[PDB]
Copies of this chain bind each other. A is one copy, B any other.
Amino acid sequence: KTLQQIDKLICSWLKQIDNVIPQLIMEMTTEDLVTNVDKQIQQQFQQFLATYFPEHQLLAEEKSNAMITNEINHLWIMDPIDGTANLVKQQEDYCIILAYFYEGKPMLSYVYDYPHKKLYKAIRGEGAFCNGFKMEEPPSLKLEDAIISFNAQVMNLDTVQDLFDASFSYRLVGACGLDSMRVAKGQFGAHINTNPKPWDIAAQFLFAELLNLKMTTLDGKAIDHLKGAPFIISNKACHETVLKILNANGGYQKY
């Protein structure tokens, strides 16, 4: 019922999920990738919800979501594995993403970096935490002093060049959730994804609010958690400059 109660349940389900994943990985089979691991984690969470919060609905990657509307009171958004490519190719640098919305308002968020056993969580009224230790607003980062992260394969190269020249350096973890959390931790100045699904960014809203980060569309607007949009999550001090570079000279999209 309370946020703490729901949080305690989710944290224990995530803990138990450590006991399932090594096996799924040992038998890993695959099919824009999708494994058994994605599907099984998702199904288990569906069953978890049937069992504890049976009014609650799920918007997730591996299910049809036709039934999900503007007015659902209790909504979870899930990415059961974000970074499937990294899971398959590296068995590292992937995460589980969850977010609970109450009447459209972010209340709980989770990014579980399972390979490193690092649970990032955010709780409206309490704050954000990594394995329990409170996260603080990161230091201010101007773009020239910041590392930035984005997919350079989906942008035109003049714009990529401008991002390179204006920033301290460039890195890529390769999972939206984890690259986002590096912004949250102050390790990156900003992460960009030019075409995310609602589940790629759903947890990030509450993190951005509680840690004073900017999270907007690439036009600087509020994002609908129900609909993807081109997006950025950014340190407050470099947000404007990134958007200016992205939108200059007819924009960032490949010619």
Q: Is the CB of A152 within 8 A of B139?
A: no
B187 and A170 contacting across the interface, CB-CB below 8 Å? no
Determine if A187 and B92 form an interchain contact, defined as CB atoms under 8 angstroms apart: yes
**Alpha-carbon distance between A169 and B90 when the two chains are bound, in angstroms:** 12
The reply to whether B171 and A173 contact each other, CB–CB distance below 8 Å, is yes
CA distance A188 to B152 in the complex (A): 18
Closest chain B residue to A31 by CB distance? B145
Besides A93-B171, A153-B169, A157-B160, 15 more A-B contacts (Cβ < 8 Å) are A30-B139, A85-B147, A86-B171, A89-B169, A89-B187, A90-B147, A90-B182, A90-B187, A92-B187, A153-B170, A157-B161, A169-B174, A170-B172, A171-B174, A172-B172
What's the minimum C-beta distance from A167 to chain B, rounded to whole angstroms? 10
- The answer to whether A85 touches B169 (Cβ under 8 A) is yes
Residues A215-235 near B (CB distance < 8 A): none
Count copies of this chain in the complex: 2
A155-186, CB under 8 A of B: which get 1 and which 0? 00100110010001111111000000010010
Query: Beyond A187-B89, A187-B92, is A164–B153 a contact (Cβ under 8 Å)?
Result: yes
Chain B nearest CB from A147 CB (Å) reads 5
A162, chain B: closest CB distance, angstroms? 12
Docked CA distance A160–B170 (Å): 14
A contact residues vs B (CB 8 Å cutoff): 30, 85-86, 89-93, 116, 139, 146-147, 152-153, 157, 160-161, 164, 168-174, 182, 185, 187-188
Which residue of chain B is the closest to A30 with respect to CB atoms? Answer: B139
* Nearest CB on B from A34, distance (A): 14
A170 touches B147 (CB 8 A): no
A-B contact pairs, 29 of them (CB 8 A): A30-B139, A85-B147, A85-B168, A86-B171, A89-B146, A89-B147, A89-B169, A90-B147, A90-B182, A90-B185, A90-B188, A91-B187, A92-B187, A93-B171, A116-B116, A147-B174, A152-B152, A152-B160, A152-B164, A152-B170, A153-B164, A153-B169, A153-B170, A157-B157, A157-B161, A169-B174, A170-B172, A171-B172, A171-B173
Q: Which residue of B lies closest to A91 (CB)?
A: B187
Distance A30 CA – B86 CA, assembled complex (angstroms):
32
A245 to chain B minimum Cβ distance, whole angstroms, is: 15
